[PDB]
DNA sequence: ATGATGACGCT
DNA sequence: AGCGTCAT
Ligand SMILES: Nc1ccn([C@@H]2O[C@H](COP(=O)(O)OP(=O)(O)OP(=O)(O)O)[C@@H](O)C2(F)F)c(=O)n1
Ligand SMILES: [Ca+2]
């Protein structure tokens with residue numbers, strides 16, 4: 063009872079750009095705005111692979127991974143924008159630079175953790191304490207929360223979507239104890255006000271819309287963010303967790319979408335995250351290990367402690383290209399030419415990074431895949447990265463992979479290579 | 493023949 | 504270090 067921690071100590075938000083690469087292309091080309099459209103890479107093989115999809119196009123069934131030729135069968139008027147191609151490969155620079163625009167706006171409000179090109183976690187605990195002191199116990203108006211959903215409401219004793227949203231918000235705000243400065247529900251609500259302001263600033267200063275989740279930890283914030291997209295935000299309170307989790311498939315929780323979650327389902331014979339509450343901590347640790355078991359015991363009760371790490375920049379800078387089916391590299395000269403292409407893009411991104419961010423990479427990771435393996439990587443080897451020079455990096459990568467060549471002939475490469483990857487890691491300040 | 497990324501855990 | 508898992 064009085065000593066049972068409830069995981070209500072932080073206010074954490076997750077901000078996610080809606081269909082991000084599509085928004086970047088629609089900002090640049092107004093002809094694409096408010097249309098079914100997608101971003102594709104390459105074009106020769108079946109129209110290119112779709113990597114991002116506008117919500118108008120999702121209504122027709124267009125998804126990521128689809129070939130554009132097939133997407134066109136579902137949506138004949140689908141508009142397409144192509145990823146830039148440089149040195150024979152996809153170049154994502156435009157989207158990395160757009161992400162920096164958004165991340166720098168977010169950093170004005172709070173320290174952020176860059177989770178991906180288009181996602182950032184925000185720890186709002188301190189910002190919320192300050193805003194509460196500025197209020198001094200004045201109520202929070204619904205006008206301060208114009209795009210916020212309160213998960214689980216309305217409830218209890220209109221048929222339109224915005225009407226539903228406002229009924230739920232009204233019930234939430236009418237129940238709020240605004241005199242208690244340490245009420246977790248109040249803290250979440252103030253967090254949501256700040257996230258409304260953050261999202262307004264992102265849209266004003268970049269043109270990009272996003273969704274967001276606000277809760278007490280990263281897993282609940284990510285789950286919340288997904289509940290109402292696009293261009294909306296959702297508050298998931300601690301009290302909403304039992305009902306929410308009672309029908310939540312286990313695979314929807316971050317880190318449980320793969321083999322571990324499938325094993326939770328198979329071993330325990332359950333389907334929903336709330337069903338985990340019926341096991342002891344020791345039972346869960348016995349099945350899934352000490353760390354995973356403790357994590358599952360707390361997480362199915364809405365409790366998680368993973369911190370929002372203060373990190374706005376990526377930790378690695380990598381360049382990779384697949385060579386599928388018949389295009390697999392079968393000669394020494396082919397392998398050197400593509401290693402050089404990758405190393406030239408890498409050198410350009412590293413030089414830009416060292417000028418912008420005052421750091422240098424010190425380790426070069428080289429990874430390859432051979433025709434036949436089912437694993438995404440067949441071999442990974444590191445060497446020293448001492449100069450930002452593409453010819454040296456490609457020579458060193460070749461040196462650390464050249465003994466993989468099964469061929470007895472010097473000029474041939476067997477088994478042919480279906481993937482090349484160069485990654486700069488282990489940054490030091492400079 | 494999805495592809496091109498990127499973070500973190502295990503041993 | 505090198506390999507694997509999970510995710511955008
Ligand atoms: N497998 C993937 C997943 C994503 N992305 C790239 O990562 C970006 C963001 O990934 P997101 O958040 O998962 O999906 P969204 O497009 O933003 O759509 P939503 O509104 O539902 O958030 C994509 O634009 C991308 F461009 F598509 C990718 O390259 N490969
Ligand atoms: Ca997104």
Ligand SMILES: [K+]
Nearest residue numbers: 078178180181
């Ligand atoms: K995302």
